């Protein structure tokens, strides 16, 4: 079971600057921490990792997904989710769960940032937990895929 | 450790009508899942579950849990999150990690929705999972809880 | 055939309130004025009143309806028809006719009391009647009634 | 007793509109309605139908109801509910009771059709009761000459 | 086949007045080169053209299509466009390809020209190529209903 | 020396009704105002009065004075002042000078008086004093008609 | 000469919570300092306090004011100034003297915090004075309702 | 017969910049067109002129009118007119007829030219006439003065 | 210790114009009873009083209060409170206690005199009170300085 | 005669993807009917096509159109069109006939659809009309440059 | 080469206000480094400084301007740059270059300080540079002058 | 000391723009006159320059700043300044002087070109002054590297 994570503009540079709002903690520390989670859990999920600065380029990530080795998508668009209708557009075709991950609360910063184009998108939206809310995003993906595949073949057989 | 679970407005009626935004479950049904959670992790949670249709009611409980026997409180304020003040000010005030979840992608609804004065008070909003985003939660809180305890003591000492 | 009347916020000080726009009739007085067009009418219909301040009892009312004695209901909310995103909820959850009475003309007073969330979820709306709205409600009730159940026993003969 | 009932723009394709809003009733059957509740109310009632997709017409109409053969006014502007200033300005100076009426809940409708500049000129406003509305209207247009005709008496005596 | 070709308010001043924006062509001259363009391409098609400045006429012709010797309609609404509701109803109650034509670009005018509610109603909205925007509208709509013709027979003998 | 006055909806009514804006006037009245102050200015101005409640027709009648026997136009557009685009379009083609007038200062009602489409393609604005505006706007009208002429010929002599 | 002091939601939590905006005082101390003032100031006065977290009982305290111990109200609202509709309606029909009090200044903080309906209903507005803000309610209470008493005595034996 | 006429800030470089607004006329210019006008006439009204950059000495200066000499006000209060409520507010304490002129059509400027605080508290407006402006409002004025001595003296005796 | 009584434009026209909102006191009458309150409370406190119609005056005096024979100012910005961001400045930069009054409530009039910039700045802000609000302020001043005071000497001999 | 066309982000997933908007028609196969076109009306007119998901990406290649073997661009800028300020400068520096196609009606959708800045920016627009929209560009195109062409040479030899 | 220095409301209290933003500076310090400025870099330029807090002094400068001993204008309208027309009328007015300095990042403070009318009828805006900006304002000044004056040489002779 | 400049969309195609916002200079002679006012000033300064349509490169820049050689930036973000979120954070997360030019006034300009996100984040702004406020900014970015460089050298050692 594969599940891509997409990491939108800036977040390569978390962990090393503004403790305030994001604390000491790297993008790789991040993506580690979701393996142990994985690999501990005993979990037959394995997790492709990307970040890019770019919004064609996590476009052309979320289109690539349809040609399914992917089963799922956790997606933390950043400043994108604000104003990339074209992002929203990508996940609404994807065909498969998507679920949106916000490090802070974003209904507590600036104006700008409260609306989520790309979230109306999503399935779900988990915001505010830190780290944290990367492995609740793997959590909800692994119990929404178990739950697809459960009803998809018994509901097929009768 | 003592988990208070305050559940608002017309969230009694739940799995009773709307298969449409929310499914078949009723909110005992919900309760019960949160139970099999912290039982079968073997997690040392207890919870107390609330249920009411009155804004003061949910102010009066959030004023209880300052009187410490609970750690923390899990909510769903229902409509209450798009028009209440007060109790975001309850929430503000009750010095412990207050997560809000909602059923629904209330980034997807009506405009009216959109907002949540509540979940900006929250440290962490979860939306859109169906009953799955109330375990979520409690998984969010546990670490949360047995972070700062972990900070805490080892802080303490040194 | 039983019909509930719920009366919103400061409608019990009626008789007492700005007299241009409310005029000098009681709440109880209201309450006879529809008697009398029930007896009058040789309508088999049984009404029950109820009045509160109380956001949540009106909530708690509607949904008490949902163990149904009662067939349709009409409402006042009152001040809480530009506010609340609760009442309207129970509204469209409770699955029976539900008819919005207004005593004065709404789209001609203050901006703030043109929007009705309440009377959106209602199937219809009456405003600027003052008491003789309420008989128009009933009216209307006892017609929709009678055109529902000549429709379900259309469609189980056949 | 003479009651004027003017209809607006695009009534007149009632019966071959979208059949969820409207059903499948034609203008000429919502005016035999209203005769038919008039012969069974013995309510000495004189009712003239006009329908015009031209503002003007509406206008023109209301104001030679100043030549006042006519008592009283029922009038379901349609569109022009919602634009016109015009028909508002004929209303306020026909100095005799209007009554809107609206097929559907225009609160529950798009954005724009929520304002009603016609109907905060008018007395009353009645709105979701499709055809059913109209014979509402003439209930309320013969109770308030009856009660404005005891009151004109009750007064020149004295 | 006959397309009926509404022109709105002001359109009869057109070729003689403002050459900035509209150019130096009347709107007779409009009509010719339609006509032009359909003797040339060889189409069976017969255009009737209407010009007014009167709101309730041009939804009086929509209203006369429906009768129809019309298989379809080109509207230019003129400032109607953003204004009138009531045309916008006409257009969807015609349940027949409407297409919307304008000279100018709308988008790029004062504020109050960038809404269309006709546009909105209409299937396609062509706007900004002078009288050309015209034979494009020809074209299109013979294309449309060539399409429906042929969907029409082959759905029915499955 | 031909002026063309229009006179929107519902200003027939004028005199008639409602003396807190408008007074005991009526419209003929304010016509035979405008007539003696031209006869004893012994101006050599011709005066033609037209008022209709039809948005059309006012843009009818903009449109014969191209064919000029009339020089100006003197104009109340009335409540389509605030909402028709298409007289205002009208008024700019023109090509004559066009000033409005109002009996009230629409600068002081309600707010959706206060925006004049048309008052914006005018050369100028009269409003708030009554019946005397009409006389200001004829002697603002003879003078730049006077003006216009006195550059005219002697600019194109030299 | 009976002053109902009726304190809004979360008040109860004074003194205890958020030093940065309401300092160390709690509740009961500032019914104190109240009762202090009336004491030595030595004033013919008894106060009677109450508070909830509750909407509807703070409209039923103010409805029971009218059936007359009490001749005027002190209130604090709190959050529901800014959402009650409802209060501020109470307020309007209690006739009697109310004066709003705000611990902090409502103009100096977030945007929904601004607009007082509540206080738009008082005859006077106190805010941002802390605890001191309370006593200056009594003084001008006191103040008002001697002018009351003198003027009621006077305006009769004229 | 004492008329002030106060013209607003930058006034006084009129006629010395930007011929496309405002033409080649002092404001010199504009005040001996007035005093023709009066002399010719034969007027028995006598003008003072006041021109200042300052918002205070305005409002000094409407002041000084109530001690009256001044029977009324022509004001031309320049970019003031769209920010000072304080200039509205002293023109509503003046008890006498002003009147607004202004030299542009400020409906077809730009947007934060559009309202006007003090052309809403002036009796009438005036606007985009340029210095002829000016005289219609002496006539305005002299009528209105003539208007208000009639009827005090005729309506006095009797 | 000196307080500055600040007053704003239009105040000196006070009690000779309009007694709906505003009275029959003079501005000078104001000041006698704030005197009166002062000498009969026996406090030792001496007022210094100022009225100006000119914005740039009012920052002067602020800006004069820095060199400091004054503890405080009390001030009523009048129309200047809702545009002036400048007088809201000079405030903040003053660092001294500023209490605003308004004789009535702005909370309940037109709409752009809800907005206080300069009501932000203050400390504390009282409105609605007629004259009565100005020695509320008076006594709320002198107890800020009284506890000021008290807390300056006992916060260094710690 | 080469028209460059450039399609928008997600247009590459068209055709198989979303049925009820957009239909079953691949981006490979509108490319083809537009060759189809121009191979069967016989026009000397070589296409190029070009789609990306990078708005960088999309200015590139209208700064590579200046550098002419382009004599015109047809594009669809998708999602883009209302966010991209970049693209709309792109297209405005140019300097030749763009024309923007959607193949949805854009009027019709969701709010944040309706604005187009790249329209605004481009001589005409079409929308609404599916793969059609794109003949119906060419169409327009080749008679625009046409016209250009005839112009060119009859404007130098006069 | 004479250059105007024109400083705004309160920048006179500046070294006194908070150190934050501007640190501890004074406006004597400012005026030294523009000397120190010209000094060191042989700028045949003569500097006249002036500071108010009046809006109407402003304006009065700008206008002696035009008597043009000076050729250019350095301002900081302070808060007037968001709420005066009037300054930027006499901007518009002056005939010669403005630059508008700002000590603070405006963009970056509250929102009502984000719009500069005066800003945007100068001919450039610098903000955020502190003292600084005034030393750039100088250079840009100096710089603009030599290119107009190389410029009016070199049309002058041709 | 090297200085990084960032050039945004379209700026390679300047001196070929609209002639009257931009003239007829090239990105290329910007950069010189950069260099030449570097060399003739003596500024230990190493420029290195970069132009991009893209918004992620823009991004990728900027973070590679962060492994520091480069000192300062220069930018100028084009159409992003108004929609990039994402710019404005690595702005944000760059920790050293960022300073933003602009050529043209964008307070002057559309309504959506006013806000830069961009703008708010950096130090200092520059707007207006076409080529020349690279020079100033330059100017700017060298006192700013010189004031910081005494400030950090005066603070290790004491
Ligand atoms: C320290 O650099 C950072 C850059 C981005 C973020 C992620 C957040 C972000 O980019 C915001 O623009 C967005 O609105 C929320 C965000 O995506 C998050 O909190 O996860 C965190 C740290
Ligand atoms: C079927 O009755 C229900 C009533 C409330 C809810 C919860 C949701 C709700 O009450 C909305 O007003 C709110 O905006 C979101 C909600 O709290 C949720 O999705 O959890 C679900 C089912
Ligand atoms: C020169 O006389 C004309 C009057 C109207 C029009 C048509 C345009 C119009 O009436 C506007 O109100 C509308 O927004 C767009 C218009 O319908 C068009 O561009 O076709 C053209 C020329
Ligand atoms: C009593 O019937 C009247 C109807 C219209 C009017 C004219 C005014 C009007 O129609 C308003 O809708 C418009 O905004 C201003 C008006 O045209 C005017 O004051 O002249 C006056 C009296
Ligand atoms: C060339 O200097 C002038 C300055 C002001 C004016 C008057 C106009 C003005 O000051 C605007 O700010 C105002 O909105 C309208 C104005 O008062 C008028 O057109 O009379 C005319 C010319
Ligand atoms: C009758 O002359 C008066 C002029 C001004 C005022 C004061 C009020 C005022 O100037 C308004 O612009 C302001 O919004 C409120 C006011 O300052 C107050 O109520 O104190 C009172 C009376």
Chains 1, 2, 3, 4, 5, 6, 7, 8, 9, 10, 11, 12 share one sequence.
Do not use: W
Not at 115 to 138: D, Q, R
Request: proline share 3%; charged share 20%.
């Amino acid at each position: 079971m594969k599940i891509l994570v997409i990491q939108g503009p800036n977040l390569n540079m978390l962990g090393h600057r503004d403790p305030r709002l994001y604390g000491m903690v790297t993008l790789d520390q991040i993506h580690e921490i979701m393996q142990t989670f994985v690999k501990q859990g005993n979990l037959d999920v394995e997790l492709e990792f990307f970040q890019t600065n770019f919004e064609g380029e996590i476009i052309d990530k979320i289109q690539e997904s349809v040609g399914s080795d992917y089963e799922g998508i956790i997606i933390n668009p950043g400043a994108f989710s604000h104003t990339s209708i074209a992002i929203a557009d990508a996940i609404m075709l994807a065909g498969k769960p998507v679920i949106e991950v916000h490090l802070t609360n974003i209904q507590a910063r600036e104006e700008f940032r409260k609306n989520s184009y790309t979230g109306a998108a999503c399935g779900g939206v988990i915001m505010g937990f830190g780290p944290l809310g990367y492995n609740m995003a793997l959590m909800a993906m692994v119990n929404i895929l178990a739950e697809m595949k459960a009803f998809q073949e018994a509901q097929k057989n009768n």
